[PDB]
């Protein structure tokens, strides 16, 4: 599952946690991120990274931390990732080096770190001993999400009946009823910037038994002009001596969910 490197590969990896109320209010969110650098050719070992000048490297809310061998100074003044010791070069063993980390915490009702909103509507059902559930979602991502997995923490006896007419992605399917994990429903696609819903009926003792519901999703692009969800990105890669001398590179921009849930 490790992506292919043609010389310099820069991975920008962000992970998002979030907690919503049943009615859709954001209680909290926390985003962690890291910039990893992989190089496999000694010709390119002796290089520097220029972050997009779109980025405020002094924003206190991002809590930016640089690897202890990176030059804090050049980073802070020039948005430049380079080694303190200008005589040394980066490892050329194709191994991931984390050169920069960041973390952002948003308080209740701040929706700036939320790629996917969530709300639930829940009534007792006719057809089963339990509940009719609708989960409304809305993406604000510019790419589309694939194989999104909603998990309810119950193990019912009768199987789940997905209301395919009242849902948006009609071919949603259950993919797991364990006892340990509970019941997990998968969705093919969530379209960029589009709202949707997932509707179904499920067996359960009482309403609180359905929560917390967890969502799980993931997204990746290899585009060289890619921005992260928080606007993180590379301007250029550049010779450690001749700063006008550009070098070639690829960049992967990921965003995975971790503890993303409705409670
Ligand atoms: Ca450029």
Swiss-Prot record:
It comes from the Eukaryota. Residues 5-263 form the MHD domain. Residues 1-157 are annotated as: Interaction with DSL1. It is found in: Cytoplasm; Golgi apparatus membrane; Cytoplasmic vesicle, COPI-coated vesicle membrane. Belongs to the adaptor complexes medium subunit family. Delta-COP subfamily. The coatomer is a cytosolic protein complex that binds to dilysine motifs and reversibly associates with Golgi non-clathrin-coated vesicles, which further mediate biosynthetic protein transport from the ER, via the Golgi up to the trans Golgi network. Coatomer complex is required for budding from Golgi membranes, and is essential for the retrograde Golgi-to-ER transport of dilysine-tagged proteins. Present with 18000 molecules/cell in log phase SD medium. Oligomeric complex that consists of at least the alpha, beta, beta', gamma, delta, epsilon and zeta subunits. Interacts with DSL1. This is Coatomer subunit delta. It comes from Saccharomyces cerevisiae (strain ATCC 204508 / S288c). The gene is RET2. The chain holds residues 284 to 546 of 546 of the full protein.
């Amino acid at each position: 599952d490790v992506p292919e490197n043609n010389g310099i590969l820069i991975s920008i990896k962000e992970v998002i946690n979030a907690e919503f109320s049943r009615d859709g209010t954001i209680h909290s969110s926390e985003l962690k991120g890291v910039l990893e650098l992989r190089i496999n050719d000694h010709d390119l070992s002796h290089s520097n990274l220029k972050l997009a000048d779109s980025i405020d490297v002094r924003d206190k809310s991002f809590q930016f931390k640089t690897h202890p061998n990176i030059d804090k100074q050049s980073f802070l003044s020039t948005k430049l990732i380079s080694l303190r010791d200008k005589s040394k070069a980066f490892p050329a063993n194709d191994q991931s080096l984390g050169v920069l980390r960041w973390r952002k915490v948003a308080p209740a009702e701040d929706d700036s770190l939320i790629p996917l909103t969530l709300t639930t509507w829940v009534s007792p059902s006719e057809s089963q001993q339990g509940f009719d559930v609708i989960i409304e979602y809305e993406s604000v991502l510019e790419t589309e999400l694939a194989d999104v997995i909603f998990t309810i923490p119950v193990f019912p006896q009768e199987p789940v009946d997905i209301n395919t007419e009242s849902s948006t992605c009609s071919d949603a399917e259950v993919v797991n009823m364990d006892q340990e994990m509970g019941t997990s429903i998968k969705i093919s696609k969530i379209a960029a910037n589009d709202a949707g819903a997932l509707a179904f009926t499920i067996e359960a003792p009482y309403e609180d038994a359905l929560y917390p519901m967890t969502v799980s999703f993931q997204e990746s692009t290899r585009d060289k002009l890619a921005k992260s969800f928080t606007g993180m990105a590379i301007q250029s890669v550049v010779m450690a001596n001749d700063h006008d001398q550009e070098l070639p590179y690829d960049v992967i921009t990921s965003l995975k969910s971790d503890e993303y849930l409705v409670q």
